[PDB]
Amino acid sequence: SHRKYEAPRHGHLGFLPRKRAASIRARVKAFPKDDRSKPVALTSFLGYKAGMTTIVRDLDRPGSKFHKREVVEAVTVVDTPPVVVVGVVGYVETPRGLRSLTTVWAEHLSDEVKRRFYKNWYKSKKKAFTKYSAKYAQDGAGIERELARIKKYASVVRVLVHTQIRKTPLAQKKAHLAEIQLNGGSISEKVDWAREHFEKTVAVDSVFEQNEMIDAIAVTKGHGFEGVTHRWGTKKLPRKTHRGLRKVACIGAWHPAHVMWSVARAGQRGYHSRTSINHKIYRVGKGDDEANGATSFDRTKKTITPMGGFVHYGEIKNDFIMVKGCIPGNRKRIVTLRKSLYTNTSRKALEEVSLKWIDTASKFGKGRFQTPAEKHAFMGTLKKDL
Amino acid sequence: ESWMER
Amino acid sequence: SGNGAQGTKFRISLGLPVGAIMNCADNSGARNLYIIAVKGSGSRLNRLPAASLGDMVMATVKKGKPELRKKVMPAIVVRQAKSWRRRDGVFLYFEDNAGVIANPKGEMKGSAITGPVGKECADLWPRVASNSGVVV
Amino acid sequence: MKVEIDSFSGAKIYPGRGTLFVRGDSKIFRFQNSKSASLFKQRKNPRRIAWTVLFRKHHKKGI
RNA sequence: UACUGAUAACCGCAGCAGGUCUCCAAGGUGAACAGCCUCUAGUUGAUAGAAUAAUGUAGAUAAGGGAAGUCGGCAAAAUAG
RNA sequence: UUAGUGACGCGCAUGAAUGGAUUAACGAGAUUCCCACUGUCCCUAUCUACUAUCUAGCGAAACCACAGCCAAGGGAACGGGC
RNA sequence: UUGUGGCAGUCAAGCGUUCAUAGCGACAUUGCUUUUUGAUUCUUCGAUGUCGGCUCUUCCUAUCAUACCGAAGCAGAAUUCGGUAAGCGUUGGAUUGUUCACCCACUAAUAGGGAACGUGAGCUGGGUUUAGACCGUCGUGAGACAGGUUAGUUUUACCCUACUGAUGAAUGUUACCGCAAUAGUAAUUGAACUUAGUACGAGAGGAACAGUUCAUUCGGAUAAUUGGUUUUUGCGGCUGUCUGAUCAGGCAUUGCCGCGAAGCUACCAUCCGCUGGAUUAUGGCUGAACGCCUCUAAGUCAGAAUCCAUGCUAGAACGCGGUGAUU
Ligand SMILES: [Mg+2]
Ligand SMILES: [Mg+2]
Ligand SMILES: [Mg+2]
Ligand SMILES: [Mg+2]
Ligand SMILES: [Mg+2]
Ligand SMILES: [Mg+2]
Ligand SMILES: [Mg+2]
Ligand SMILES: [Mg+2]
Ligand SMILES: [Mg+2]
Ligand SMILES: [Mg+2]
Ligand SMILES: [Mg+2]
Ligand SMILES: [Mg+2]
Ligand SMILES: [Mg+2]
Ligand SMILES: [Mg+2]
Ligand SMILES: [Mg+2]
Ligand SMILES: [Mg+2]
Ligand SMILES: [Mg+2]
Ligand SMILES: [Mg+2]
Ligand SMILES: [Mg+2]
Ligand SMILES: [Mg+2]
Ligand SMILES: [Mg+2]
Ligand SMILES: [Mg+2]
Ligand SMILES: [Mg+2]
Ligand SMILES: [Mg+2]
Ligand SMILES: [Mg+2]
Ligand SMILES: [Mg+2]
Ligand SMILES: [Mg+2]
Ligand SMILES: [Mg+2]
Ligand SMILES: [Mg+2]
Ligand SMILES: [Mg+2]
Ligand SMILES: [Mg+2]
Ligand SMILES: [Mg+2]
Ligand SMILES: [Mg+2]
Ligand SMILES: [Mg+2]
Ligand SMILES: [Mg+2]
Ligand SMILES: [Mg+2]
Ligand SMILES: [Mg+2]
Questions:
Q1: What Å distances lie between residue D56 and A172, A369, D10, D59, CA to CA?
Q2: Beta-strand (E) ranges in chain D?
Q3: What does residue A379 show for φ and ψ, rounded to 5 degrees?
Q4: Phi, then psi, of D36 in degrees rounded to 5
């Protein structure tokens, strides 16, 4: 018979199977459509999520009740040390998809990146790219003809970059390596850009700019095996339920004599790869700079890092991206920042954002202070002091 | 022993 | 909101599900108001319609004048007592739940309001704003 | 933006931090934390709480 | 005429959380052989180790509302000398 | 408010030790409302111990024609087999 | 099977100021359905766990609302009829065990149904329908009563399959970067301001497109802040007892109380939720058939919450590629 009262499906079926991601680094399953007119640039970047903090800014939204008034907003910080370009590979179109024909690498690969090709680095002759590097040193023979092959073919071109993990406080020592598409023009110019940038570094200022909308692609926080209640948001059965209330009561009708795929079942929660779109950049900050956390209105020389450091991460001694709101992933997780795929005007993606203040108080508690000088002024001399 | 089918 | 609601209201946390008795802040002769409905409320299985500061609810009078009791009438919430976030970032709350009696287009039946009112309700109902002394 | 002062402790309140309590007499009490809010609700006096600015003033500590 | 007199000597198919008559009875708190702690005396027995997912059993806490839940205030809370 | 209470009564088929009508006190009896109280609920979340889990040792039972992917058809008119 | 129930047609005497068909439609007649109730007794009596509710999923369309349209006895506003459409939604409560019903209220709307009259090794057990007991009526009596009342044990999964997640041999080894067949897919609805007291209308009344700001339901994340949680048994305090006192502590099955970081977490907190093509209905172009006319027959334009892609989620463990090192 028919359901007594209507209600919607608990959960989204296009986010199935709610399984563990195949890797910890989510992969970009789509890059922005290429305009073969603009200069050569990366469509994405690699960074590590540090944490979240608090922002004040004056809103410019004509029609709202908070126009030209101060609002408080949550931002997330992504430590973005400059990536290092080691390699390109060309993709050509086929009736079975895009297919890579060649991958050209740089001559000198750094240890942190050739650690990505080992599961046991402490016991190895390290023997990686030791013949490919001797493929150089005869002027360009085995390399320039591969690049010319990529030029003659390869409607799509992607650069291999790796992270400078040693510049972060993470104790991982193993760089993340990724393919990032180039969306300039003239595949010859694409690959010449790559060749010139081999062994060289690319900063986030050359890729992202302020008030720009981006997508964050990351594997989300893991929570292990979870029951249907928190996994799907189903109703708790009442108190006097024998053999458990934290369940789904009916998991199907008699016919079809099967459990359907659309029925809420217990299982893995978290560690899914997620793409979250339209997160505005509120600041692109440099690491060759103090007063990273200063504004036009505060003007007190303080870095972006809170007192005591970002909890479970550390400092932001390198460059960073302050992006509005909440992005998938937890602290210390590799995040892939991607340019938007469509032009969103929207009267909200075009708002020019001018920050007024940045919270640099401790996140290890109820922080009263933003700076140790402020702490010292408020509290006075202590028994530790002289 | 259920006295129900009655 | 609705008929006499001049403007829009940013969301603020709901505290007053149907069944809630809140004090009456005006001088119409009613002491409390028993909420039986909320205007502008959605429909979800088992979800109780709940009201916040600024909402126009349907209410009865349980304690007060007999000519007001035993009948349904519109009311407006002016104090919540559950914390809600302003876009200024501050969370704020009163100590009691409080409403006033009104007509479906927002004109207050009484002439005064005892205690403070929320600026969110004052901006949404001008007859409330006129008869309100302190607005926070 | 303005930096406010805790009505109980005297601590500075930066934006988005703490709570605000409007009392029936229309008075506004700003709290930096649930600690001071809870002591207020427990009806404690700040002049007898040893970490409050008012205690330290009344006792001449760092004056 | 020894010995047990019972979470192992009795009866329950058994070294079963059941049942099975009675005597003696310290200090403190406190109305109190109540509950809680301790002295004398007696035990330290019950398969263990490593982890801390779901669902459970037992115990609990929860903003604002306050029986709108349910056949029904079932359960729990509140009260308590 | 198909509930409850108070009244009405041509009462299918009330009624007098088949006891009738009352009734203070009493009731782990059946019931309605009110105050208070609360995670019963809005709407869920979190913590603890013992489990489940993995290991060493020990080691059953129910049940069992053969066995175990589905749709339709027909068919003892709802098949795992056709 | 379909009498009965429900739904839909044909015809057109009439109603509708005039006027059969805007909307209705008698006398008659053709059918569909199987959510009614019956008829039947094919299966099941070496047992297929019956009412209802709670919970959860899917499906149908005979569409209540939402999108797009056609018609009117459509001036506007509101309403009625109809079409393509099941993509998305369809509530909270008083009484009743109820299905059903009836009222209150919100709502864009409170549409109908199926899935062994879905769903009891999923719950509950209020009712029905063992045994106790009361009443009324019937009965000489024992006892009877789809008459009423009260009390009345809801067992087992560790197996196969399915489902959710999780490993994994073999494709020379091992490692890294990738492709993308197939499967799934998601966003939804409303108000306010303005348009505008404008169009329309004698007046009364009274819109709409674009645009802006917000909100409803849903979903996916997140924990800066607020709140919750507290074996941080972290700090402090309190009781009783014990360690001669002090200090410092033990026990009270986490002794109690306040605060309480971290972590987890809440529409109780915050952020986010894409744009292109092909089409339905319908309206049209040219244009014959039928020297005229005709959206249609050839051909074609625009067009929906529709479909397919973009995008998003997995990645075939017998689908594939490129690269590194290869004792
Ligand atoms: Mg339905
Ligand atoms: Mg049903
Ligand atoms: Mg969630
Ligand atoms: Mg039970
Ligand atoms: Mg913190
Ligand atoms: Mg319900
Ligand atoms: Mg002897
Ligand atoms: Mg002897
Ligand atoms: Mg003896
Ligand atoms: Mg004895
Ligand atoms: Mg003895
Ligand atoms: Mg024996
Ligand atoms: Mg015997
Ligand atoms: Mg005494
Ligand atoms: Mg004695
Ligand atoms: Mg005693
Ligand atoms: Mg044992
Ligand atoms: Mg109910
Ligand atoms: Mg009699
Ligand atoms: Mg079959
Ligand atoms: Mg069989
Ligand atoms: Mg055969
Ligand atoms: Mg029929
Ligand atoms: Mg018929
Ligand atoms: Mg039969
Ligand atoms: Mg039978
Ligand atoms: Mg059998
Ligand atoms: Mg069965
Ligand atoms: Mg249809
Ligand atoms: Mg049937
Ligand atoms: Mg079943
Ligand atoms: Mg009986
Ligand atoms: Mg007789
Ligand atoms: Mg009978
Ligand atoms: Mg807290
Ligand atoms: Mg916390
Ligand atoms: Mg023409």
A1: 48, 19, 11, 5
A2: 4-5, 12-13, 19-22, 28-31
A3: -85, -30
A4: -65, -35
Alpha-carbon distance of A305 to C100, in angstroms, equals: 48
Tokens of D62: 């760092």
Give me the residues of D, 9-48, that contact A with CB < 8 A.
11-12, 14-17, 32-33, 35
- Before A256, cis peptide (omega within 30)? yes
**Structural resolution in Å:** 2.6
Q: How far is CA A347 from CA A60, A316, A343, A350, A357, in A?
A: 10, 32, 12, 6, 24
C-alpha distances in Å from residue A99, one per residue of A103, A187, D10:
11, 16, 66
- CA–CA distances in Å: residue A112 to residues A50, A200, C125, D16, D21: 21, 15, 64, 41, 54
E-only strand ranges, A60-150: 70-79, 83-94, 97-104
Whether A106 and A131 have beta carbons less than 8 Å apart is answered as no
Go through chain D and list every residue after which a break occurs, taking a C to next N gap over 2.5 angstroms, comma-separated: none
Residue identified by tokens 């189903």 is A234
| Nearest CA among C102, C94, C97 for reference residue C76 | C102
Q: Which nucleotides of G are covered by protein (CB under 7 A)?
A: 47, 49-50, 53-59, 88-93, 104-110, 112-125, 128-130, 154-155, 162-167, 174-181, 184-186, 191-193, 211-228, 258-276, 310-315, 319-326
